[PDB]
Amino acid sequence: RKTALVTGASRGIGRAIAERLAQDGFYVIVNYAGNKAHAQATVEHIIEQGGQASAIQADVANEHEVSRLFQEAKAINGRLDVVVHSAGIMPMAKITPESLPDFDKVIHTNLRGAFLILAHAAETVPDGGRIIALSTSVIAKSFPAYGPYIASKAGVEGLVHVLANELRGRNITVNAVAPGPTGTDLFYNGKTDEQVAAIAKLAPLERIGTPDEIAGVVAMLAGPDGRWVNSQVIRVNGGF
Amino acid sequence: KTALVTGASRGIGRAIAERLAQDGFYVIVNYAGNKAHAQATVEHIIEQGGQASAIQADVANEHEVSRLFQEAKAINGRLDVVVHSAGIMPMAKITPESLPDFDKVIHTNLRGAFLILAHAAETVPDGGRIIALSTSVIAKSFPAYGPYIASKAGVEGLVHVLANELRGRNITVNAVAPGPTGTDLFYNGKTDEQVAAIAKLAPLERIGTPDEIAGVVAMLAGPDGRWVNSQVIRVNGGF
Amino acid sequence: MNISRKTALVTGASRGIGRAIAERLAQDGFYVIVNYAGNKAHAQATVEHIIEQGGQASAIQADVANEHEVSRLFQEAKAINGRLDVVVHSAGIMPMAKITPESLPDFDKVIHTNLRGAFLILAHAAETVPDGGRIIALSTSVIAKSFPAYGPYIASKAGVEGLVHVLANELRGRNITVNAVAPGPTGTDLFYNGKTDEQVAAIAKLAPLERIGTPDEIAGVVAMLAGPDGRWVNSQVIRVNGGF
Amino acid sequence: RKTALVTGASRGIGRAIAERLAQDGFYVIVNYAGNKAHAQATVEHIIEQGGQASAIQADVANEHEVSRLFQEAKAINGRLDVVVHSAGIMPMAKITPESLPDFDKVIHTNLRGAFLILAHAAETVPDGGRIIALSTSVIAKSFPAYGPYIASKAGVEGLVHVLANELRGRNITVNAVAPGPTGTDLFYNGKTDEQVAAIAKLAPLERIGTPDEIAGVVAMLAGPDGRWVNSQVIRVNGGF
Numbered sequence: 005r006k007t008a009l010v011t012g013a014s015r016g017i018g019r020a021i022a023e024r025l026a027q028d029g030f031y032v033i034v035n036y037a038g039n040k041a042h043a044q045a046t047v048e049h050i051i052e053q054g055g056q057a058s059a060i061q062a063d064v065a066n067e068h069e070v071s072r073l074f075q076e077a078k079a080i081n082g083r084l085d086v087v088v089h090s091a092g093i094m095p096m097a098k099i100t101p102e103s104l105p106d107f108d109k110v111i112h113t114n115l116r117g118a119f120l121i122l123a124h125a126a127e128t129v130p131d132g133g134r135i136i137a138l139s140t141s142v143i144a145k146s147f148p149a150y151g152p153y154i155a156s157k158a159g160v161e162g163l164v165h166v167l168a169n170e171l172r173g174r175n176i177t178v179n180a181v182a183p184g185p186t187g188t189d190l191f192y193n194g195k196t197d198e199q200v201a202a203i204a205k206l207a208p209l210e211r212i213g214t215p216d217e218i219a220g221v222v223a224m225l226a227g228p229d230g231r232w233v234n235s236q237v238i239r240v241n242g243g244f
Numbered sequence: 245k246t247a248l249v250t251g252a253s254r255g256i257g258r259a260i261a262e263r264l265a266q267d268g269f270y271v272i273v274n275y276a277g278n279k280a281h282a283q284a285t286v287e288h289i290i291e292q293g294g295q296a297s298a299i300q301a302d303v304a305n306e307h308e309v310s311r312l313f314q315e316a317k318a319i320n321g322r323l324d325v326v327v328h329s330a331g332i333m334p335m336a337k338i339t340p341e342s343l344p345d346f347d348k349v350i351h352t353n354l355r356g357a358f359l360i361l362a363h364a365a366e367t368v369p370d371g372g373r374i375i376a377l378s379t380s381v382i383a384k385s386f387p388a389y390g391p392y393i394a395s396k397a398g399v400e401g402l403v404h405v406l407a408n409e410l411r412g413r414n415i416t417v418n419a420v421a422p423g424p425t426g427t428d429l430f431y432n433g434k435t436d437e438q439v440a441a442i443a444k445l446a447p448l449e450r451i452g453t454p455d456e457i458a459g460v461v462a463m464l465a466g467p468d469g470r471w472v473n474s475q476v477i478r479v480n481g482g483f
Numbered sequence: 484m485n486i487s488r489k490t491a492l493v494t495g496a497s498r499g500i501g502r503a504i505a506e507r508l509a510q511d512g513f514y515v516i517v518n519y520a521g522n523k524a525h526a527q528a529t530v531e532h533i534i535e536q537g538g539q540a541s542a543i544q545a546d547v548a549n550e551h552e553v554s555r556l557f558q559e560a561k562a563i564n565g566r567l568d569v570v571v572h573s574a575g576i577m578p579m580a581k582i583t584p585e586s587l588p589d590f591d592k593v594i595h596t597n598l599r600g601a602f603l604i605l606a607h608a609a610e611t612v613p614d615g616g617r618i619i620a621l622s623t624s625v626i627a628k629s630f631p632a633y634g635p636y637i638a639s640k641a642g643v644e645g646l647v648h649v650l651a652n653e654l655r656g657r658n659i660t661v662n663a664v665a666p667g668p669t670g671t672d673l674f675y676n677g678k679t680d681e682q683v684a685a686i687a688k689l690a691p692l693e694r695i696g697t698p699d700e701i702a703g704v705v706a707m708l709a710g711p712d713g714r715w716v717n718s719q720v721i722r723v724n725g726g727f
Numbered sequence: 728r729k730t731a732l733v734t735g736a737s738r739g740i741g742r743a744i745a746e747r748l749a750q751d752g753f754y755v756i757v758n759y760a761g762n763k764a765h766a767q768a769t770v771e772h773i774i775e776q777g778g779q780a781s782a783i784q785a786d787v788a789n790e791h792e793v794s795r796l797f798q799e800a801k802a803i804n805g806r807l808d809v810v811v812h813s814a815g816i817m818p819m820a821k822i823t824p825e826s827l828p829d830f831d832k833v834i835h836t837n838l839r840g841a842f843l844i845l846a847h848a849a850e851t852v853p854d855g856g857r858i859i860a861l862s863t864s865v866i867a868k869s870f871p872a873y874g875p876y877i878a879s880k881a882g883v884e885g886l887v888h889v890l891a892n893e894l895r896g897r898n899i900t901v902n903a904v905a906p907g908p909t910g911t912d913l914f915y916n917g918k919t920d921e922q923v924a925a926i927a928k929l930a931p932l933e934r935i936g937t938p939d940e941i942a943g944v945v946a947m948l949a950g951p952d953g954r955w956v957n958s959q960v961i962r963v964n965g966g967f
Contacts, residue, residue: 067827099842099846099890107842111834111882119822122822123823123824146888148892149893151842154888155883158884159878162866165869166878171447172447172449173449177482208410208474217468217470218471220463220467220468220471229459229462231456231459232456232457232459232480234447235447238475241471242473243407243408243416338602338606338653355591358582358587358590366583366584385649385652386649387655390650394642395642397645398642401634402638405631408631655933660932660966691892692898692955697955700954704953712944712946715937715943716944717931717965717966718966719962721961723956726892
């Protein structure tokens with residue numbers, strides 16, 4: 005039985021990824037940053053559905069907590085076959101001097117965090133393993149106030165491509181999944197139906213994509229059908 | 245549910261047809277010239293427990309494609325998935341002497357794609373999927389690949405536009421872009437040194453198989469591909 | 484050897500972007516061959532505008548998608564000064580047609596004029612441009628938007644870009660750059676005469692600069708690519724669209 | 728009277744850009760980080776050839792030094808028409824935990840620095856001005872050990888596109904120039920005759936690109952022929 009670590013699996017896309025990987029037969033480490041309640045709910049949903057999982061706290065941007073995370077994750081089953089990095093933040097801030105704090109925070113959490121996870125994955129994933137990062141489709145649109153977020157995720161994609169090359173000879177694929185707007189609980193919670201309808205109309209399929217539809221592409225990349233997909237950023241956005 | 249696969253006689257097209265049959269689709273194996281390999285594909289599908297049938301059609305001939313789609317949809321009254329894999333890849337540098345070759349590739353690869361996509365746009369139901377095969381070599385722009393790259397870049401353009409034109413029909417349009425794959429043909433015309441040289445190009449350091457391409461096609465044709473739309477997915481082991 | 488003036492051939496130079504390219508290249512010191520397809524009047528107007536401004540130019544008829552007329556075009560154009568330093572391929576059509584069986588004629592036409600035409604020009608350029616010369620094709624920025632009814636056009640221009648990249652590699656050792664310029668919507672006389680003011684305003688707002696780009700603004704990038712500042716730019720598609 | 732600020736103008740591409748902009752009629756602020764000697768050499772060559780320039784020290788990643796840089800630069804002629812951000816570093820480090828210091832360094836100097844310069848440029852450049860960042864062509868190749876550098880420059884490109892959108896209504900273009908390897912003195916001093924020969928055969932033009940060949944594209948973007956070029960990353964690499 006193969007083991008998968010999923011960062012940011014307490015809610016939303018990360019939770020959907022963790023639950024789908026558990027359904028696919030992976031033992032899932034549900035990594036979370038702060039309050040364990042949602043993470044333990046993820047673990048319990050996995051166990052009730054017939055899978056195995058356990059939760060580990062770690063801030064992905066804290067090098068010491070990441071060192072511990074990977075040791076503790078390896079302690080469970082002695083192996084780390086798949087690593088999926090979904091944890092990140094998306095604050096809004098225009099490219100102005102006053103936004104410098106927000107910028108630093110996003111870079112710290114999304115990009116440095118990604119580096120940490122990827123770096124440790126590169127050291128611990130076995131031959132034949134898989135490393136998957138979550139990027140974003142909004143990189144293609146360059147919307148105002150998304151500067152810091154887009155910068156962080158573009159950096160992540162760059163790291164993904166380089167790492168795919170650096171792991172030559174280990175038969176380890178490195179890819180990214182870049183979702184568009186996704187119908188998480190948080191997404192719906194902050195929006196009126198009119199706002200939802202406008203976002204739905206942005207895609208030619210004219211609806212809101214679900215977290216499970218993102219997790220399905222992650223599951224492809226983690227499984228046998230993803231054996232020959234390497235150094236790719238797959239945008240999952242309904243055509244938007 | 246029914247899937248039509250063009251160029252399904254051998255290689256990547258055959259692997260696609262067989263995997264889709266294994267995923268539960270009734271498969272129309274479309275072929276160009278000699279039936280034999282197409283019927284072998286049909287028989288392998290039936291042998292493994294699936295349903296399939298073979299139909300002849302030149303993808304670049306409007307009348308033969310119109311007939312292909314009328315007949316394919318007539319089998320079960322539906323054409324849920326259309327996969328366009330048929331194409332040719334001749335080598336010719338960009339010189340006036342290559343004009344015949346250029347015309348040929350554009351005719352088979354680009355006009356062909358236009359036809360298939362067009363008829364797919366007319367016949368696929370709500371919730372269906374349209375998938376074209378492009379190529380990863382677009383990224384490298386190697387000498388003598390000019391005509392081939394031009395045809396396939398045009399195909400990708402059609403894919404994105406069609407994805408937008410089918411707004412309101414709930415139909416995804418995507419492309420899969422393989423690198424070199426270990427077909428039977430790939431192996432018959434190469435020495436072991438050539439194969440070894442190609443194997444080292446990918447960071448995974450081996451030769452990709454047709455089944456590894458068919459797996460991504462199957463993702464796009466199945467439940468996990470519902471929210472993938474207007475994408476060109478390159479499947480090349482990282483090369 | 485050759486003390487004749489540096490020469491540029493510009494296809495589709497009768498009007499619009501092609502005309503602006505021809506006039507700007509003449510201002511930069513090129514003898515300009517104004518290639519046109521059908522009615523000479525506008526092509527001769529381009530030539531006369533060039534000559535009134537103190538440049539040298541002459542007009543040659545050829546349909547860029549006709550191999551025989553293109554063979555003649557290059558024989559005659561190179562004969563003027565014994566050289567063809569720069570080749571700019573601007574000629575093309577942009578009809579609207581959705582991806583449907585009934586659109587097949589239109590598709591065939593666009594592919595024929597835009598892509599096969601490009602192939603001919605590029606191919607002949609590859610045979611005639613000297614070491615240090617420049618080959619520039621015109622593509623389109625609309626490739627990025629994949630608008631409905633632009634399928635055939637986008638397919639044709641994406642094919643052109645593919646040819647550009649390959650040709651840049653095939654001319655290794657000849658020191659010949661091959662590039663494309665991809666304009667967004669441009670304020671040609673045709674553009675303004677066929678658009679309502681509300682349509683014009685809607686298109687103007689698409690770019691962050693909130694205006695309609697001019698043909699001279701496209702020609703300026705072409706001139707960069709054809710001159711000393713473009714020496715190290717090779718195998719690029721430069722989108723000139725005001726940020727849209 | 729028209730003014731251009733060039734960061735990293737002490738040597739190499741930045742110097743070539745400063746000298747070309749001066750030759751094009753700009754008053755040039757030669758910004759440097761530490762090495763005053765070379766910055767004054769630039770400033771001098773400009774004055775020697777008939778131009779006007781002056782040097783200003785600032786570490787582009789220091790918010791206070793950058794605020795001062797822009798205050799002082801704008802004070803010279805009361806205007807700052809063009810801003811070109813060329814300053815950056817390119818250390819080699821694979822994606823492993825031990826590389827975290829190098830990573831942190833590059834992100835700080837290349838990306839946070841870019842954020843600062845662009846942010847202040849967006850505040851100080853007049854309507855009709857130009858903002859040009861320097862990226863890199865190596866993003867296309869994702870070579871091993873280039874991970875951190877590529878991540879930083881990919882982030883810069885993201886910021887460029889977003890800023891182009893955020894300055895809607897101000898008539899300010901934001902672009903990047905992405906050079907390949909260039910025949911700097913730094914480039915040549917660490918290389919053998921055969922190494923140079925091998926690099927020279929990478930491009931189809933089969934030679935080494937010069938800093939002036941990059942500066943010519945920057946100058947196009949800063950001048951009348953660049954009025955309609957916006958939100959673009961122009962790769963200047965001889966076709967490699």
